[PDB]
Amino acid sequence: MKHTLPDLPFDYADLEPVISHEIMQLHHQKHHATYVNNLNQIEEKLHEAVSKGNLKEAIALQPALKFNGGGHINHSIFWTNLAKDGGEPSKELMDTIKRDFGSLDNLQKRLSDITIAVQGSGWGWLGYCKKDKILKIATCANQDPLEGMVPLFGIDVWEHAYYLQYKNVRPDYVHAIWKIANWKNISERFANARQ
Amino acid sequence: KHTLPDLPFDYADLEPVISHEIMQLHHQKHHATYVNNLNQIEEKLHEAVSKGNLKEAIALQPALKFNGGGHINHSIFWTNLAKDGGEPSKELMDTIKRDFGSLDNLQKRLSDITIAVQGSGWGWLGYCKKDKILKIATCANQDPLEGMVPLFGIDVWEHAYYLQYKNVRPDYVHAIWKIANWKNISERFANARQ
Ligand SMILES: [Mn+2]
Ligand SMILES: [Mn+2]
């Protein structure tokens, strides 16, 4: 069925002073909504090419599906990943963070560093690899969804995610976002990944 | 579901430019494998799409492009080769002269970019409908030619030449011109023009 823009789990000003209401409103109501609207159109075109047996046309639509579909997936996760009252990692997630990264401080530094280092637009991710049964960190370009591991916590480093507030100073945003990481949600995603 | 197209000639008909053993493996194993895998990948994709698993549907894209591109590219390729392909039509020769100077210049330029492909891929002569001009391009792996109409393709995956030419890819790329099916290429040009 048709994709829709999910409501935010909070009001647009609820993450201040870490992310402005200006940013939250544009990011959700314009940027995410555009991915949803475009995704619905691209899925319809792809379904048509598949049904008509137009293989070249189906292949040609793949970048648009990955871009808008990835945009929808990424931002849908990102909204649930943010909270004013995030809380603390679950006992099991904390244990696993300690096992895989030494400490929460180490994880935060390492993920912040690779996220800050993204050239152009993209995302940093904490994920869970089900095959190796370990936490891992990665970056993705543009809206490429995190693949091969289950996403737990994502940091959007497209310039639109921070520029109105932070201007060029991307590291201030990336370090600050940890203050609003929704550990309740991240812990739920971790529990789900290990089932 | 997709099927392996019959060759329009017998397996030894392109000798001495491309051997019987190459044609047999290239058609019956390599192209067949793309067809078989393409059919399986389409079914995995439909299940992902019908169940609403957008993430999995995106994850399956590289396999569709690779196997689907494999099927597309080789299906064109077989029609592009002939023991006695003739010469370009007058209209095609005129356009070749317009856009490249001469057939000699087009052959040199396309051979050069095709030889220069790093790893596996294809060289293409194509017709761009927007700008109404012939162009040359290369594609990586099995990526189909996009944004122009394919007219003549040169497979430079090592399996296309290795048994006969070994490491000497340039001798193969230069020699394939001897078996270019200009009857087919000229027809593809005429269709691209309308
Ligand atoms: Mn964004
Ligand atoms: Mn081949």
UniProtKB/Swiss-Prot annotation, chain B:
Q: What GO CC terms are in its UniProt record?
A: mitochondrion; respiratory chain complex
Residue sites binding Mn(2+) per the record: H26, H74, D155, H159
User: Principal localization?
Assistant: mitochondrion
The positions making up the signal sequence are: none
Which InterPro entries does the entry link to?
A: Fe/Mn_Superoxide_Dismutase, Mn/Fe_SOD, Mn/Fe_SOD_BS, Mn/Fe_SOD_C, Mn/Fe_SOD_N, Mn/Fe_SOD_N_sf, SOD_C_sf
Q: Where does this one sit in the cell?
A: Mitochondrion
Family of this protein: Belongs to the iron/manganese superoxide dismutase family.
Protein name, UniProt field: Superoxide dismutase [Mn] 2, mitochondrial
What enzyme class is recorded for this protein?
A: oxidoreductase
> Which UniProt key words apply to this protein?
Manganese, Metal-binding, Mitochondrion, Oxidoreductase, Transit peptide
Q: Which reaction does it catalyse?
A: 2 superoxide + 2 H(+) = H2O2 + O2
Superkingdom of the source? Eukaryota
Is Membrane a UniProt keyword of this protein?
no
Catalytic activity, EC = 1.15.1.1
Oligomeric form and interacting partners = Homotetramer.
Any one GO molecular function term: superoxide dismutase activity
Where does tissue-level expression of this protein occur?
A: Expressed in pharynx and rectum. Upon thermal stress, expressed in vulva, body wall muscles and hypodermis.
Which BP terms from GO are recorded? removal of superoxide radicals
Q: Which cofactor does it need?
A: Mn(2+)
Factors inducing expression: By heat.
Its job = Destroys superoxide anion radicals which are normally produced within the cells and which are toxic to biological systems.
